[PDB]
Amino acid sequence: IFKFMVIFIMVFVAFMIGMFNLYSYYIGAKQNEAFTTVEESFKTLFWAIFGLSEVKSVVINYNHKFIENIGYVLYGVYNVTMVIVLLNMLIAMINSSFQ
Amino acid sequence: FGLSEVKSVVINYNHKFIENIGYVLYGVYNVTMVIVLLNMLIAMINSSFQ
Amino acid sequence: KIMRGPFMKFVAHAASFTIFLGLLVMNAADRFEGTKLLPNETSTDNAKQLFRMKTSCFSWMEMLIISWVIGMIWAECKEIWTQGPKEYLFELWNMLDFGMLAIFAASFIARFMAFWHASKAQSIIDKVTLGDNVKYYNLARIKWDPSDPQIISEGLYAIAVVLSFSRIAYILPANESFGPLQISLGRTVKD
Ligand SMILES: CCCCCCCCCCCC(=O)OC[C@@H](COP(=O)(O)OCC[N+](C)(C)C)OC(=O)CCCCCCCCC
Ligand SMILES: CC(C)CCC[C@@H](C)[C@H]1CC[C@H]2[C@@H]3CC=C4C[C@@H](OC(=O)CCC(=O)O)CC[C@]4(C)[C@H]3CC[C@]12C
Numbered sequence: 539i540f541k542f543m544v545i546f547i548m549v550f551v552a553f554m555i556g557m558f559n560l561y562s563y564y565i566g567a568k569q570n571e572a573f574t575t576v577e578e579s580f581k582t583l584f585w586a587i588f589g590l591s592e593v594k595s596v597v598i599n600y601n602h603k604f605i606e607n608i609g610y611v612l613y614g615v616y617n618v619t620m621v622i623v624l625l626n627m628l629i630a631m632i633n634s635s636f637q
Numbered sequence: 638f639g640l641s642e643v644k645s646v647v648i649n650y651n652h653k654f655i656e657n658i659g660y661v662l663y664g665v666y667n668v669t670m671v672i673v674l675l676n677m678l679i680a681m682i683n684s685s686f687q
Numbered sequence: 688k689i690m691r692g693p694f695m696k697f698v699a700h701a702a703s704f705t706i707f708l709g710l711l712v713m714n715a716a717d718r719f720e721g722t723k724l725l726p727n728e729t730s731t732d733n734a735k736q737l738f739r740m741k742t743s744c745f746s747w748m749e750m751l752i753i754s755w756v757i758g759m760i761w762a763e764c765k766e767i768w769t770q771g772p773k774e775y776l777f778e779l780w781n782m783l784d785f786g787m788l789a790i791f792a793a794s795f796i797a798r799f800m801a802f803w804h805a806s807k808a809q810s811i812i813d814k815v816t817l818g819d820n821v822k823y824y825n826l827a828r829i830k831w832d833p834s835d836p837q838i839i840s841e842g843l844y845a846i847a848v849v850l851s852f853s854r855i856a857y858i859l860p861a862n863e864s865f866g867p868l869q870i871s872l873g874r875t876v877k878d
């Protein structure tokens with residue numbers, strides 16, 4: 539478990555820096571305050587694991603749908619990647635007990 | 638991921654035929670996706686026990 | 688004689704990748720706790736230049752990032768012709784590496800042409816109502832076009848920053864604890 543937490547931290551830090559670099563210039567022009575600082579990006583992507591981060595945390599108010607669609611794609615890829623790392627941690631924990 | 642609410646499928650009129658079709662289709666979609674995920678897990682287990 | 692051994696070459700490459708990731712972290716260091724530049728306001732800090740010159744000028748950290756990615760494209764293009772487009776394109780992580788480098792290159796290409804348009808508009812007109820050729824400058828974030836060449840750069844830069852963390856898999860199978868874990872991930876990725 540403590541070896542897959544490193545992979546979790548790597549994917550988390552990568553997507554945190556990416557979405558903070560994407561959404562930092564829209565701090566007052568979003569629906570909520572997510573991804574506008576490092577603290578808000580942290581508490582969005584952490585509670586997205588347990589389903590406590592809403593999907594409207596990624597939309598903006600302007601007509602820049604380029605950056606909004608980048609945010610949708612990045613957030614979906616983050617969720618699928620986290621589910622895949624969890625499903626591999628489960629198989630590693632099974633193999634570590636069948637020995 | 639559970640980020641789509643269940644009231645995304647209801648309408649305002651009294652056409653409950655189409656609304657009940659939508660409920661049944663959305664429930665069947667959710668159960669089918671859970672079944673495909675549970676089969677992907679078993680395939681990933683079998684691909685590692687070899 | 689020590690610095691040309693294989694293990695010290697591996698340590699030097701890992702250190703250069705660590706410097707690149709630290710540069711990608713510390714590039715956005717003025718906005719960690721708040722931007723202090725609202726999308727409605729505008730700041731020039733010189734009272735002669737327009738607003739689109741402050742937002743398009745390359746910093747020294749961006750110049751270092753451009754230097755690192757130019758070195759990466761050079762070290763990849765040196766190796767694609769050594770193996771040909773048969774051993775290179777067959778591996779599917781070379782697709783991810785070439786995609787990350789291409790998205791970085793497209794981001795810097797879009798930022799350069801945005802800066803070129805801004806510098807041309809500031810050069811041809813070096814507080815009254817400006818004419819209808821440089822009036823789409825000195826404007827806030829609301830009144831940009833949806834296809835502005837700076838928001839294309841800012842959109843591709845985030846994807847490239849996410850994808851650049853995938854190069855940990857090139858230095859990770861050298862470890863006795865995270866090598867078999869990567870082997871197990873690659874075993875289960877096919878299903
Ligand atoms: C519409 C749906 C959208 C789908 C998107 C989901 C993305 C799926 C990601 C799967 C990653 C994986 O299993 O990769 C397996 C192994 C490589 O195996 P091998 O086949 O051994 O590859 C060998 C690679 N090589 C050693 C040759 C360089 O990956 C790793 O090594 C993980 C790296 C650790 C941290 C990386 C952070 C990533 C942040 C984005
Ligand atoms: C190494 C490999 C695996 C890279 C995989 C590709 C994707 C991760 C990237 C590269 C191309 C990108 C796309 C390029 C073009 C479009 C269309 C664009 O649509 C609009 O701009 C809306 C209209 C407007 O207001 O301009 C939004 C971003 C988007 C979806 C991008 C989404 C993310 C993409 C798919």
Ligand SMILES: CC(C)CCC[C@@H](C)[C@H]1CC[C@H]2[C@@H]3CC=C4C[C@@H](OC(=O)CCC(=O)O)CC[C@]4(C)[C@H]3CC[C@]12C
Pocket residue numbers: 651652653654655657658661
């Ligand atoms: C190949 C096999 C597996 C097909 C399986 C059958 C179902 C997928 C379909 C066929 C019959 C359908 C039903 C036919 C009749 C009804 C009642 C109807 O109720 C109303 O109209 C409310 C009152 C009104 O306002 O009229 C709504 C649709 C519903 C539930 C349908 C739901 C979906 C059903 C079950």
Ligand SMILES: CC(C)CCC[C@@H](C)[C@H]1CC[C@H]2[C@@H]3CC=C4C[C@@H](OC(=O)CCC(=O)O)CC[C@]4(C)[C@H]3CC[C@]12C
Pocket residue numbers: 547548551552694701705708855858859861862863
């Ligand atoms: C929070 C995350 C994003 C960390 C940020 C990136 C780096 C600071 C980390 C990630 C990957 C790490 C590397 C993973 C593997 C190794 C191998 C290790 O050497 C060996 O195990 C082999 C020695 C032998 O041959 O006997 C030296 C450290 C090093 C390079 C690590 C150095 C620090 C790195 C670059």
Ligand SMILES: O=C([C@H]1COc2ccccc2O1)N1CCC2(C=Nc3ccc(Cl)cc32)CC1
Pocket residue numbers: 607610611612613614615
């Ligand atoms: O939700 C998403 C993301 C979620 O994460 C993803 C992860 C991997 C692949 C796809 C993903 O889609 N989007 C993006 C695409 C979107 C934007 N405009 C259109 C137009 C037509 C269609 Cl058919 C779709 C769209 C809708 C919202």
Ligand SMILES: O=C([C@H]1COc2ccccc2O1)N1CCC2(C=Nc3ccc(Cl)cc32)CC1
Pocket residue numbers: 657660661662663664665
């Ligand atoms: O939520 C659903 C769906 C969800 O997906 C399904 C998937 C497979 C099978 C059943 C499913 O029910 N419905 C449909 C049925 C409904 C409409 N009118 C009545 C009256 C009495 C009862 Cl007892 C039930 C109902 C309630 C809402």
